[model samples]
Target: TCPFYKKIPGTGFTVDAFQYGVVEGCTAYFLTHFHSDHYAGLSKHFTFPVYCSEITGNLLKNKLHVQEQYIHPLPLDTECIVNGVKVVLLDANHCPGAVMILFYLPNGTVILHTGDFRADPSMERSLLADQKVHMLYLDTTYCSPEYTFPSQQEVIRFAINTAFEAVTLNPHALVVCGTYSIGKEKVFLAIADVLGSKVGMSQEKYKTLQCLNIPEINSLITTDMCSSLVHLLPMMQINFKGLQSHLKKCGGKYNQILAFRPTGWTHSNKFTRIADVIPQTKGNISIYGIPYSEHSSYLEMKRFVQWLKPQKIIPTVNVGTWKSRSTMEKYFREWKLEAGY
Candidate 1:
């Protein structure tokens, strides 16, 4: 029930979705990243003039069969004009190709749409030198104070070490790293390096991973053909089949499957973390949840709002499915800019 699209009041430009009554009549479409939720209704075959980062453009065109002519790829920290509006893109730091869309209007108003991003120092520090933001479209994924998880680097250390340890403790046991189709290769490939096992991926994941074209990064990954000691798979596919139960018939005690879903939801239980042992994981199917996230925490959001001091704040999350609006009011209400209302 999340709201997928946001309209840029006067302009025909659309953010994340294609739902303005105008349809193709919109000036251009902006894509933040390749995450399915952000690109929910998008298909490569759609004949629309899309604006996104170069990585995103290649991913859609080559991987999803999108026509090259219809896409306009832009670079970060640069300016461009679209439909007579001046625009620039900022690094989102969420995942590859994620960006914060900034629109500089002729009326001296700057609108910032912070696409799904992590609150890294480099991110907020970079914003400190830019023009004061008048309106902010925030990513409020974890809107409540209860979500004060550790930084991505700390969580990565925890996830990587925990995954490697799990494999060592259980011999011949395959560690099927559960991740989203595009992001979180850190946990999958990092663990492969630790375990001395070649990283494996499905065709879809492999295609996206190959686009990185990085020597140090690409050396660890190998195509998973269903026979590797370790397998990299999507979070949804880690059920009965990925578990040893599918091969339970001919399974030996050592042929167990351990599923590790690296995500931020696991933070609800303080007992489970990178250095902590999973308290409830038992049996031939051992699943561990890691609290790794890309979005800013509630405190981080407050810090951002307190610093940016924008005239107004709009929670990007849906007011329908979640209590994001009220939460934003509670947390971000006291914060207002000195220059504007």
Candidate 2:
């Protein structure tokens, strides 16, 4: 179920009061992203007018195929009055369609809800400077300092280097690396920038990237830059012979294929095991598991909460439930707001 708000059974009100706003005459529900974890419950429980960024609305309609009645699109960074609350959308940087919401209430309370965000200096400096937020609902997915992630640029560099090494070693082998549709686009662009050519994307991946108006990155050629050497192929089509033929023509130099998988989740190990098999040629195969992610680490989360100085802080999202809550609780206790809620 969506984590935004839930109803209080006996009181016939929402436990958080925010959900109650939707049912008890709240102006609108602002959704930060189209991810299932954020919007899954909205389609069933409440039908009040919903608000999101224009990109997010299109993603919901085209990608998720949600019902039209539930959408109300607003341009990013533009403020709108829904019901009565004033809301603004900022770049979340987690996913292409993701956004961070800033809500201004009539009572002078300003709440900033970051659905998911990373410590991307560019994004943070751009989105967090304008307002003095009273309450910040932050993303604590990587709240622990122990969970360090490499920069996006570094990961791209790593992928390109790995691909180049693999292809150089095998003159007749295909190399495939797996990554999420949105996240991997950067890797592909990096590859094109490195190699100086337009890396071919499968029809499905093409359509998805096209929807984001990523034409500049999508239309790049291998000769465009230094890191543009590798090409992006879809996960499903990685094993296809057509891809093999195309790679062979690109310069029998690209014998190895690499695939990127974003999550080291349950299926990742299985997929890695299977990738060990290379057809009749006995070509070498390898899956590089990079510890790259977009969420803020544990220390970052604590810093965000400390900076916001909220009256009460609550945890949401997967990492929060599994790893952040206890750490955050300690932070709140240390800050003397443990009993605020």
Candidate 3:
């Protein structure tokens, strides 16, 4: 599948590694993040040289137990050499260790792999000023107008205030915020920082965060369930059933168990609020899902494409599963400039 690997036009550099059997021929590999969909068929047995952010490299070493010598940190803002090509790593603004890969090939083609990122103006301006982008390998997660919503920063503010008021109103409540195995750390870290609270997490999560050595996240962790005002669970465990089962024996002392799930799915069908508090509840447990997505909204995607004006847009999803080119070109039209942007 095309999503399995993105190769430089003239050379043998592949962006991201996959587990889909033989990743074909490649000189080196670049990793965007720790998400399974991106890593796919990767394992400790892999022998290719992998380049990623410091946090991602540590995950490969500590979590996946991949060989340390093969896992290399792709330092942000620094030009590095790999397989005769000049590559640079830029912050993706999607997750703790996520980064966008910029490749400067020998033939002078500038290829950008925006590995699951959001629209951060500073990052956009800094990385792409006055540079001609030949091809853009994009994260088309929310590439439809139906996903019109506010940015993650705005949603993070709303979530922080929501949790602040929720816990203030219920003094002894246990607020459980759910995120992916490695993503959406923005909301969790912000809430903890503002409230001056310690986040309770399982040992597995604690070790993952520990390897990143991020002070903001490292400072918020606590092992005791009751000592902390909030608990951080993996995003998979954010639904109604997920919340109900976890709160059953949560020390049996919490007056209320509030679960907060920040995801883009909540706003896919319409222009919802930055964060919506759902009425769904179970036993003293209340759940709310926030529109805190790492990918750009359809409107934001247009804004980004308009800024770059790349000659070609390559979708990062598998060809067998989704229609990216046909669906996007009909609406986007080969990145044609729409009236009034």
* Local distance difference test values of all predictions, in order: 0.72, 0.55, 0.76
Error of 1 at 320 (Å): 1.2
Q: Which lDDT value does model 3 have at 211? A: 80
Number of the candidate with higher TM-score, 1 or 3: 3
Residues 209-318, model 2: lDDT tens digits: 65565556545633322233454545554444645554566654544555554441233323433224233332433444554566765555555565555765555544
> What's the best-to-worst order under TM-score?
3, 1, 2
Candidate 1 similarity to native, TM-score: 0.87
User: Total backbone clashes of model 2?
Assistant: 45
* 1-341: candidate 1 lDDT, tens digit per residue: 22434766667777887433345447788998988867766665577788999888878887777788888999888889987998988888777778899988778888889988776656666644667988888888877777777766787777667667777787767777777656666777677777877777667777787765446865677774444566776678667655655445334534667777777655464544456646235466677666767778877776777777788777777456546567667667655432234
Sliding window of 10 residues with minimal summed lDDT for model 1: 245-254
Tens digits of per-residue lDDT for model 3 on 221-321?
87776677788888898877777777776767677877787767663437445554454687777877777777887877777887777877887753445
Q: Which one is best on TM-score?
A: 3
lDDT of 1 at 255: 66
The whole-model C-alpha lDDT of candidate 1 against the native structure comes to 0.72
TM-score of each: 0.87, 0.70, 0.90
User: In candidate 1, residue 90 scores what lDDT?
Assistant: 88
